[PDB]
């Protein structure tokens, strides 16, 4: 039951995202936000837990928070059990005010279960706090993510960091020698020169949704996951988004039949954006933790801590051979959706809306 609520929360979060930016490129990992939100819940008490679990569509009458955690930890264990062919590295964490002593029990629990590590942070002289947090996030990853935090206010109380990066190879890798410079149409008469990679004489899961006015194709990775590319027709993206629901995603996944597509064209883009989730989570349904009344007793036990900044950066690469590259015609020269899901179960690893691959 965790996966369905994960997908619902993902869709609500994406809807809020587009509401804050109708045409800008959208990229975020629902899995990363899910683990960050659950880990924040790990340190909550009283009605803050109830609100943070009203978020992500959780029926507390049937599902208890301990079992939610255990399912999350099992998900992380399975993800880390994967071999080198596909890897998804997640490193979200929490930076606590150093003037308040952090709970040793909470740090041990986070390290053992959610694997996140927290420490006292010298938030005094926030200019140096920016430097130290950027240095930590750069040392954590291999170098995929830098300048994650744009700014820090004076006497910022605590900050939540969430980063993520995929690394997987296509089942049908694109040919770099066939990557052609073409046009991507922003609108009816607006286009940008962007490189697109091409395939031919290949069969993939494909579905033309005649009652939804879109086209869904599935590109499988060498691992147990895959990606779904969603191409609405001209001036029909908003209608697709409006009727875009998990009940739509289930029908799309169960209506994926193999088709011998003639040529497939896909923009060569590497989206990377940072997102501050204060207002967006406030509109989502989690609001008490942000107004100096979080009752975050699992963090220190003093109810002195509340969330001030939640910054998430989802970096994901779409090249010829996947990340860090060395009849029926499908051309993605229009703004399109992209949802990364497993074949076994429905759970959104990554979700993106691409409107300008030059950006």
């Amino acid at each position: 039951g965790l996966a369905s609520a994960n997908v619902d929360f993902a869709f609500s979060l994406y809807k809020q995202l587009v509401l804050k930016a109708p045409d800008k490129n959208v990229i975020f990992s629902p899995l990363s936000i899910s683990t960050a939100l659950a880990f924040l819940s790990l340190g909550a008490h009283n009605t803050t837990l109830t609100e943070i679990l009203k978020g992500l569509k959780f029926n507390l009458t049937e599902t208890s928070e301990a079992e939610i955690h255990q399912s999350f930890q099992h998900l992380l264990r399975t993800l880390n059990q994967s071999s080198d062919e596909l890897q998804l590295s997640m490193g979200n964490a929490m930076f606590v005010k150093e003037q308040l002593s952090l709970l040793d029990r909470f740090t041990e629990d986070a390290k053992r279960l959610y694997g996140s590590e927290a420490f006292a942070t010298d938030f005094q002289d926030s200019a140096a706090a920016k430097k130290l947090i950027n240095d930590y996030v750069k040392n954590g990853t291999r170098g995929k993510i830098t300048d994650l935090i744009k700014d820090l206010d004076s006497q910022t109380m605590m900050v939540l960091v969430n980063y993520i990066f995929f690394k997987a190879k296509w089942e049908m890798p694109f040919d770099p020698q066939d990557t052609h410079q073409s046009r991507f149409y922003l609108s009816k008469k607006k286009w940008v020169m962007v490189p697109m990679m091409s395939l031919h004489h290949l069969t993939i899961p494909y579905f033309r949704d005649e009652e939804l006015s879109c086209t869904v194709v599935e590109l499988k990775y060498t691992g147990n996951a895959s990606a779904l590319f969603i191409l609405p027709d001209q001036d029909k993206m908003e209608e697709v988004e409006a009727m875009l629901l998990p009940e739509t995603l289930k029908r799309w996944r169960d209506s994926l039949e193999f088709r011998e597509i003639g040529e497939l064209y896909l923009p060569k883009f590497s989206i990377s954006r940072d997102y501050n989730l204060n207002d967006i989570l406030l509109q989502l349904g989690i609001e008490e933790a942000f107004t100096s009344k979080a009752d975050l007793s699992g963090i220190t036990g003093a109810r002195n801590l509340a969330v001030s900044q939640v910054v998430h950066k989802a970096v994901l690469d779409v090249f010829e051979e996947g990340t860090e590259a060395s009849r029926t015609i499908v051309r993605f020269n229009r703004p399109f959706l992209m949802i990364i899901v497993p074949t076994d179960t429905q759970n959104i690893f990554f979700m993106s809306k691409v409107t300008n691959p030059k950006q």
Binding site: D178, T179, Q181, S198
Partner: protein
């Protein structure tokens, strides 16, 4: 001018999306030419025949 490179660029990586690299003063063999050489019709020596 042998001392100065060209402001134009030449292909470095080939294929459908050719990246272009600028010219230095070391690579004189890739200097672009304003005018082409004259035609040659079987202009070969007696050692070929």
């Amino acid at each position: 001018n042998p001392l100065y490179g060209s402001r134009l660029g030449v292909p470095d990586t080939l294929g459908g999306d050719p990246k272009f690299r600028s010219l230095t003063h070391e690579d004189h063999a890739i200097q672009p030419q304003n005018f082409m050489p004259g035609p040659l019709v079987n202009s070969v020596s007696t050692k070929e025949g």
